[PDB]
């Protein structure tokens, strides 16, 4: 039933993947296996600053005339960068499929980094970071990553430290561009009203030129009592992209006192962070933590079939919604070709969901949550946030 994800490989190694559908607008994107994990602390903001510079003009389309083109067909141009992947995607109509692909080709190669722009984008990036500190949950998740992957490139943030941002030059960027933009590490993903043969011919016409971590388990703390609310994230080591019990762990998250309580399973190449982030008033924090740890131990010890069935239904609803809409679908095609090397269909996801029962859920939860050293990141009025012995003791039960 689901549109097949027919894919192809060029000589370059750029896998061109597409999933046709009736919708007449499409989301064509380029996914690159290049993030802050591939940076070596001397170019810690190269991907972010290149992501800023990538829409400011190329050699063939100098300056704003380029974005005039993406205004002319009424298309939308977006880009994002994570610790492992970079994406440049365009939402457009179906009939504008060739030029969009050509536009994406310029954005990945033949891009032009203007020195003038470099200073302007440095002030943009610098200022944003100077104000980024405002977003607490981003501060807390960056603190959690730092404390978690200490000593690993994974830990380094995407934006990088202001230091590097100021100290960056075209040549450095050029390097990151010429080093981490290789054709075998690139996926051209298309979702919606696209034909796979036409997209393959367009990728042959243009874009045919494109040329390990540790979980510290320690905690970090940022006390600032003037903030009204406190954000606390607690995580343990995740399995990675290719380990199937992720699915079971997702069901566990679907099973799970603070104003906001969110569970996350962030996955990187054979590693990750599995845990919970909550934002609370100071005088509640410890009780939240206690609450939360109890739920984890209940999932390690006393999982029943009804909550497992509820979590499976929640995961099925979550995925289907995820694979609805051109943007998400393409996004899923790009991440699936970069991480798994293939697009996992929804029927295989449903099979892996329905094979999950309560016994293997509490087995996998005991494997990943029980008696594990967590990474803790707190920001705000976090004096009543318990220290590491109390959290570590709450990571197990004396009654099992």
């Amino acid at each position: 039933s689901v549109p097949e994800t027919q894919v192809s490989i060029l000589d370059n190694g750029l896998r061109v993947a597409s999933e046709q559908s009736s919708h007449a607008t499409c989301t064509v994107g380029v996914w690159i296996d290049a993030g802050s994990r591939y940076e070596t602390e001397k170019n810690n903001g190269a991907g972010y600053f290149l992501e800023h510079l990538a829409f400011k003009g190329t050699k063939n389309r100098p300056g704003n005339a380029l974005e005039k083109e993406v205004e002319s067909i009424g298309a939308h141009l977006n880009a994002y960068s994570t610790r492992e992947h970079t994406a440049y995607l365009i939402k457009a109509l179906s009939k504008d499929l060739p030029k969009v692909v050509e536009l994406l080709a310029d954005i990945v190669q033949n891009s032009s980094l203007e020195d003038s722009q470099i200073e302007k984008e440095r002030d943009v990036i610098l200022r944003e970071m100077q104000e980024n500190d405002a977003s607490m949950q981003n501060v807390v998740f960056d603190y959690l990553h730092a404390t978690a992957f200490q000593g690993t490139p994974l830990a380094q943030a995407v934006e990088g430290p202001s230091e590097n941002v100021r100290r960056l030059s075209r040549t450095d960027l050029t390097d990151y561009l010429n080093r981490h933009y290789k054709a075998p590490r690139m996926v051209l993903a298309a979702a919606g009203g696209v034909e796979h043969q036409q997209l393959l011919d367009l990728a042959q016409k243009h874009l045919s030129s494109v040329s390990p971590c540790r979980f510290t388990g320690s905690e970090i703390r940022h006390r600032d009592d003037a903030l009204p609310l406190a954000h606390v994230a607690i995580a343990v080591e995740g399995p990675g992209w290719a380990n199937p019990d992720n699915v079971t762990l997702q069901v566990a998250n679907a099973i799970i006192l603070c104003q906001s309580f969110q569970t996350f399973n962030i996955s990187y190449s054979d590693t990750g962070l599995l845990g919970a982030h909550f934002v609370c008033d100071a005088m509640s924090i410890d009780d939240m933590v206690f609450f939360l740890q109890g739920q984890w131990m209940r999932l390690c010890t006393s999982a029943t079939e009804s909550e497992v069935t509820r979590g499976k239904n929640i995961l099925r609803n979550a995925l289907v919604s995820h694979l609805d809409g051109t943007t998400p679908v393409c996004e899923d095609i790009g991440r699936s070709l970069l991480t798994y090397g293939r697009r996992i269909p929804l029927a295989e996801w449903e099979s892996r969901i329905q094979e999950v029962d309560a016994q293997m859920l509490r087995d996998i939860c005991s494997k990943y949550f029980y008696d594990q050293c967590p990474a803790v990141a707190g920001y705000g009025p976090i004096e009543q946030l318990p220290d590491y012995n109390r959290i570590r003791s709450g990571m197990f039960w004396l009654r099992f």
């Binding site: 980024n132 500190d133 200490q150 000593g151 830990a155 943030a157 430290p161 970090i220």
Partner: peptide, 24 residues
């Protein structure tokens, strides 16, 4: 932002890898 500062290395204190965790 806060990104500028980095975590100090506790390797000095740090002792000897889930393989080892079980033993540790």
């Amino acid at each position: 932002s806060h990104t500028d500062v980095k975590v100090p290395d506790f390797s000095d204190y740090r002792r000897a890898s889930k393989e080892s965790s079980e033993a540790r």
